[PDB]
Structure formats: C-alpha cells, structure tokens
Amino acid sequence: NETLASLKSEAESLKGKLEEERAKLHDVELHQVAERVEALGQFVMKTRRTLKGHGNKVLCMDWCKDKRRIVSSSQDGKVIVWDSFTTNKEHAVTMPCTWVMACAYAPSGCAIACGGLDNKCSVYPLTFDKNENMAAKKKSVAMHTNYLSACSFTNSDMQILTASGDGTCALWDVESGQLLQSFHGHGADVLCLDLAPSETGNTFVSGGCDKKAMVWDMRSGQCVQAFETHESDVNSVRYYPSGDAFASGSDDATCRLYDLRADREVAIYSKESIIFGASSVDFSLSGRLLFAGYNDYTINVWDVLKGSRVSILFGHENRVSTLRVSPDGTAFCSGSWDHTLRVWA
Amino acid sequence: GQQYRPRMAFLQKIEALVKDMQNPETGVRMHNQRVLVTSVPHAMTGGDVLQWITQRLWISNLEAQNLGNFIVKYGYIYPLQDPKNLILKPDSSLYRFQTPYFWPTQQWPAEDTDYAIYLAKRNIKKKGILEEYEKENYDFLNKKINYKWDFVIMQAKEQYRTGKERNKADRYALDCQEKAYWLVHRSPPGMNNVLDYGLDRVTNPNEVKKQTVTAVRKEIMYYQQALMRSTVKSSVSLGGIVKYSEQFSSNDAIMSGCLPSNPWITDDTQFWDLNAKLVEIPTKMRVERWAFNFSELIRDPKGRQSFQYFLKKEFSGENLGFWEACEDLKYGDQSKVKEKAEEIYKLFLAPGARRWINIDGKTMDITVKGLRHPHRYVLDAAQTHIYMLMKKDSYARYLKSPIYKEMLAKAIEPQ
Structure with missing residues (x-):
C-alpha cells in the first residue's frame, strides 16, 4: 500500500519537526531550576486512622470537599461513605455488580458517583433519611461498552466525566444521561483521568494501556497534547495544582512530571529498588510533594522539584490501589487490596 | 468482557x-x-x-x-x-x-493439565502423600479435564519413571524445586495469591496492531494541530512551577504544619472550625492566600463575596453575576442550555439589558454569531473576556483597596 507507506513517512516527518520545534525552547532542566529551593524538614507522617469495613479489596476513594468525609468502593460491590475523622460509617450501598473500580464525591457533598464491571457510572444522592435506601435512588448516567475505570464530577453535581476499558472517555449530563462528548484516541483500555484546575476549565487528562497520557479539549473532543514516555500502562494521572503540569504513575514503576506550557516530560521519579507498579499519585497542596501508592504494598513520597525520594511508607498488607491528598492538604488517604483504608498525617 | x-x-x-x-x-x-x-x-x-x-x-x-x-x-x-x-x-x-x-510469565498462566500431571505424579510417589488442599484440587481436575485424564496419567507415569534414574539427592532436590513452583501458582487456601492482577484487559497488550490509513491520517492531524500551538521556554514554565510551590509552601500543612494544629495529629478540630467555607471572619492565612493569584480569591466563597462588594462599589457588581451565569450554563443541566443561553444574553448583554455589562465589539460578534445556534460553550468567549478583565484590572486594585486592607486587619490569627 503506497498511500499507507507515504502517510507513515509524512507522520514521522511531522513527529520529528514537532520534536525539533519543541527542542528549541528546552533551555534548562527542572533539577537545575530547583537547584536552590529550600530543603524539606524531617518526614514524620504516620497512620492516624484505619478504616475497616469493606469485605474485599478497596479499589478507589475520593474525599468530600468538607475535608473529612470519604467515599470508597470495593471489589465486592460495596460503596461506603465514612466520616474519616471519627471513622463512623454514614452511608452504604451495594451495587448490582462487583469490581466497583471508580467512585467520586460530588462537589455539593450531597451525591456520589460510581461503577465498574457494570459498564456504567451511576449517581446516588446522600440524605439524612433514618433507614436510608440508597439502592432505591440509583440513577444510571454513563453507559460504556466495557468496564468503567474512573469517574469524576466536573465543576457541578450535574456533569460527569468517565473513562472506560472500551478505550474512550466521555462527558455526560447527569439529569438526562445524555452523552455530551466522547473522547477517542487511546489505543487501548483507559484507566484514569483528572480534570484540569486551570482558569479556563476546558481540559482534562487521561491515561491508559497504550502507555500514553492525553490532554483533551472538552469542547471539541480533540486530544490537544499527548505524552508517550512511559514504558508500560499509565495507571494514574493528576494535575499539578497550578494546572500547568501533571504527573502520572505507571506499571513501569515510575512516576513522571510533564510540563504543559513547554510541552515536555521534565522529571522521572524512580529508584532501582522500586520495581513494582505505581497505581495512584497525588500532590500535596503546594505541589512540592508527590505521594504514590505501589503494587508492592508501599507508598513512596517524592520531592517534585528536586526529584529525590522523600520517604517510603510501610503498613498496608496488600497493593495500595488508590491514594488522594485531602482537600485542605492536612492528610492523605490510601486504599488497599488489604480491605482497608488509612489516613496519614 | x-x-x-x-x-x-x-x-x-x-x-x-x-x-x-x-x-x-x-x-x-x-x-x-x-x-x-x-x-x-x-x-x-x-x-x-x-x-x-x-x-x-x-x-x-x-x-x-x-x-x-x-x-x-x-x-x-x-x-x-x-x-x-x-x-x-x-x-x-x-x-x-x-x-x-x-x-x-506475563502472557501465560500455569495450566490445569500441567498441574494435574504434577498431582497425579505426586499421588504415585505415595498413596495420598497429598495434602488436603491438593486432594481437593486433584478431585476437581479429574472432573473438569476428565477427557484429558488418560494423557494426564500417561504423562505422570512417564515422568515418575524418568525421575527414578536420579540418585536420592537429585530426586529430593528436584521434588523440592517443583513443589516450590506449585506453591506459588496453585497456593494453599488462606495464603496470598501474589499472582492476582485484578481484571483482564479489553485490549491485548501483546498485539502488534497494523496501523490503518485512518489511524495515520489522525496521527498527522495531531502533529499539524500541535505544530500550530505555541509553547514557552523551559526556564519560563519551570520557573513558574518552582515559584508556585514556593509561594504556597506555608499553606501546605503536610510540609509546614498549621495553626493551631493539624486535626489529624492532635484531634483538635479548631483548624477546620476556623476555616469553614462560610465562616463569618476568615483567618489571616486565608485572606493572605487571596493575594497569591486571582483564582485563589474567586474560588473562595468568602473571597468572592469580598471581591463582589468591591465591584458593586465601583458599579461593576454584575460582572461576577454574568461570570457565574456562564459557569452554570456550561456545567449545569443541559436540557435547558438553548433557553438559558438566550436568557443570559437578554439579561446581561443585549442593548438595554437589566443587568447590562460591557464587552468589546469582537467578543459581542463572536457571541451573537454563536447564539444563532446556541450550545453550552456559546458564552465561553464573553465569559473569558469578563474573567480576564477582572483579573487584569480589578484584582490588583482590589488588593490595594481599603476593603481588602480592612479584611486583612480584622482576620483571625490563631495558634
């Protein structure tokens, strides 16, 4: 096929031209720019709370914007809302399917979204009803052709972003269940997503089993920026708090930082002793620290700017599957295949 | 699946x-x-x-x-x-x-036929030297792969026969080696299955997929689009990142602590109480944070309330109302969008509007042309125009105003 051969030659030509156009402005490395940032104090974080109640692997968690409530979901189909400060369970629902791989808290704090092997994402309201029946109030919003891997509310309770093993992400209207926009481009299962905290608020990033992280324009459905430097599946993605960079965690045992304004990978956080996959990443409030959970049951904490490991945290008795820093930056929560979550500070 | x-x-x-x-x-x-x-x-x-x-x-x-x-x-x-x-x-x-x-291996699990052969062989080396769980496993397989059983037994007898040509030390060593494999790949009950990898994938990672023309065309489109996009020097972007983390350092409680204390460490919830979303009088840290950048002010409801008071005093107290209306249009219920878009234009933008705000000629034209076919991003240009105007003009003047200064002065200092 001559047309195919010529197109591939043109695509490689443009790839190299783009590489060279970007390289012209790559005048410094992050470790050089950060040469004189102040050193960190002693690392002293420990487990403050252990949330016990799930009957099988914890797969996902999300903090409420109230800074203390947490939603978490399990392989056995159960979703729990905790007041993590007291450890009290406030809400509980069993989904009609197993492997609830995704859950999100609504910004109002009055709803949660979740799904997984059901190929859907559903919204449940949270109420102060005495004998609360959550299952009776399930609203199916998203429909994919394969499993849901990730979800998030946008900047309201009325819209939801999903990622799927079907290779797509999608934006949905909660009230109608209408597909607002599909995002096609990943070569394979999409595993994670995060909404950009930018002033514009028109983009999000996703990661998948094509080993790529892709930044999407929600208005057009187009991928505007793609990054392909990981050597295996991209399990987690997270914007740096200013919105001008994001981090990823991968099966390849590295976490990486990408500079969106210069359009370049700028840091690789890795050690020879760290050979198992990173499942989950999140930033401290200032973006100075990156917390990551790993398949070898540990958490590694990285100095984003200096590139060195700050600490390794032991405690979980199976994979760390999910990790979020709290909304006010005072703590972080890890969830694990050991059936538990921990809050650290 | x-x-x-x-x-x-x-x-x-x-x-x-x-x-x-x-x-x-x-x-x-x-x-x-x-x-x-x-x-x-x-x-x-x-x-x-x-x-x-x-x-x-x-x-x-x-x-x-x-x-x-x-x-x-x-x-x-x-x-x-x-x-x-x-x-x-x-x-x-x-x-x-x-x-x-x-x-x-990544692609190939241990196979039931091979496990059956191992168990059938072990069975011969005793009567039931088989452990409890292994007897269960053996019985399960005798049923499941009943059709392969003549082969399983033949192969077990074959390997058992060949095993006898080794001396005592080699036979013992080889038996230990093979048992160690099966302990990992067919673990006793109540032992961790380290081989549990969660769910399978829809897409085969080992597939070398032929790129179609449509695929390569789409790759070309990505590059052509990307080449149209502007970037900055790494010294500029990375300088910004370093400066951002430095600026927010004292607000990062994990790094720097907080006042009076971290509730997770001391169990004192005062830090949360003092920083309630809609607290009457904010902490000094909070008010100071509004000065870091415009988004910090806008995203804090107490900050936005203070900023709105400043704007109303300057007769600009509809800009923020317009910005909020556009935010709800874009992120809210979509059954409404067409009507909502038209009513926002009539209320804020049209000549004689009852909540009139000024936008420049170009922005108005983009808006009016878009409104010929209303959609959820139809007011995006007007929204951005008004947001950037607030950011560039009003924000810095707000920070220099008696309103912000009085806020700083009355703000709570804990500890």
Missing part, C-alpha cells in the same frame, strides 16, 4: 536482579555442597541474599526485606525448609534459585 492479561513490567525487572545475583564475580555468596547434587544450583542463605540486595541497591534493611520477600513470593527464589513460608528470612535458612522454566 475482558480477555487479556495486563502488562507486567515488574517481571523483567525481577529477572534482571536475579541475573545480577547469579553473576560469578559479583553475585550472592553461595554455599559448598558436600553431598553431590547435579540437578539444581548450590544453596545460599537468606541473610546473604538480603545483604546482597541491601548493598547492591543501597537501601535500608526494611526496604531490602520487602523486596526480598517479593522475589520469594513470585517464586524466583525458594526456601529449602519451612516451604509454606514464602518470605526471605534474614538468617542462615537456605534457599535456591528457581530454574527459569518455573518463572512466572
């Missing part, structure tokens, strides 16, 4: 480490073998493997112990005594390297 095993990048990495350990000049210290055993490598102690890891990777004994444990759990190294205990003991306990034939 899902058909394919996921990528397992860790395997090659363990294998590289194991190869390093077996190096003749720099590998793990090995032991003599006064009894002649030809079928397996020489033994080594758990302590020596651990010391090698600690030294090679330059890490704490805790981290080396964790890693060493996984090398054993995955079956690359196995114990000669207490075999059910898949840890690397930091002592004189003996271990051997597993043969590569019995390493785990």
